[PDB]
Design a protein around this nucleic acid. Sequence first.
DNA 1: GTGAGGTTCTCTGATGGAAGCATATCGT
DNA 2: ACGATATG
RNA 3: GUGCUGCUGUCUCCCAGACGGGAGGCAGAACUGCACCUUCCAUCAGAGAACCUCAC
Length: 316
Amino acid sequence: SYKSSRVLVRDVPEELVDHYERSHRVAAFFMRLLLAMRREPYSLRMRDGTEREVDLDETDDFLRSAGCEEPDAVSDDLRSFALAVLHQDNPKKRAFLESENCVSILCLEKSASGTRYYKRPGYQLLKKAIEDKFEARFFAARDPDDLGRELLKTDTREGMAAALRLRERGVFPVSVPEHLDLDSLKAAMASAAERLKSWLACNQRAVAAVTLCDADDSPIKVRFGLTGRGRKFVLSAAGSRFLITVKLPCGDVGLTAVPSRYFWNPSVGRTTSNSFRIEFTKRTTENRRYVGEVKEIGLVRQRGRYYFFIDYNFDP
DNA sequence: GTGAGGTTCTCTGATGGAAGCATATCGT
DNA sequence: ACGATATG
RNA sequence: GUGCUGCUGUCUCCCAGACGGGAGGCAGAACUGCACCUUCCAUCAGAGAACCUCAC
């Protein structure tokens, strides 16, 4: 259940503008790098309209520029990674249930991501059993730690073991263009994965061109979440307006939204479940009351004007 | 002076896709 | 109890 | 804030012209009047303008 609106902001500082204009280039690099790992020549649609054909040579050169010295040898593994990121694996046993989860092995030198099992079913039953007559070796002598290694050595989702294969070869940590923190990288990679997933669903529907992200031509949402998908934000009201401030690494960025007749007489309260409860009336004639929990807003620059897309959740 | 048959620009409509986070443990 | 990754 | 309409605003176009009216484009807003889930992508059908030749 979703319901969206749009609030205009006219005094965005330099920090948010640079964050919006710097998230796009990381997204574009993610799109081109995933296509490079895919190692399948494709068609690129430029801004003015031109379906150029890009072959394996430029793909290999781009991969070399990304740190993959000899993509010919690791071709059995780069491709095996990309299909995992673009959700081309089995619907069950996804190596990355959310695509943005992948940018910790790809773009973090000291990460140690692959050796985790605390959320693996099997370590949940044994730990709930320490503190054979139940429905599901290691039950004797207890030690769920050992079951962790038993379930990490085997039961490895394809593309996650493949990702760990390259890190020993010193080629997988890829130098992205800008030094975005984990959260903004995850937001950008979520957007890029969404755009390439749509592209591939269209390419297999046809059987064909790729449009890269642009700050003005084909904008994407620089999304701000409350659980690590993007930089955090907090919403409130002051009179008849919206007070939206985000928590960028350069500090807090506060912003006052010009009044909206869609959101009139606003009352806002923070919730203990990572959300903000807001009330409003639709103005016009009937002032029917609505309750909305907001958890993740978006930012889009259209016609030179900055708009936050307030995507809230209403009562069903 | 129109009809007919081809490019070359601005648009609008319909049917597809990707979407708008939950939990979990560990170290302080 | 709260923040830092990790991943359902 | 967004399609619709609305200068207390602007620019431009056309018809009578020295009374006005009829096209469009922005600024809107601090002016109502009906409503408002939306962003991006790729296809396919349809409608408009104009462009070139050859025929009647």
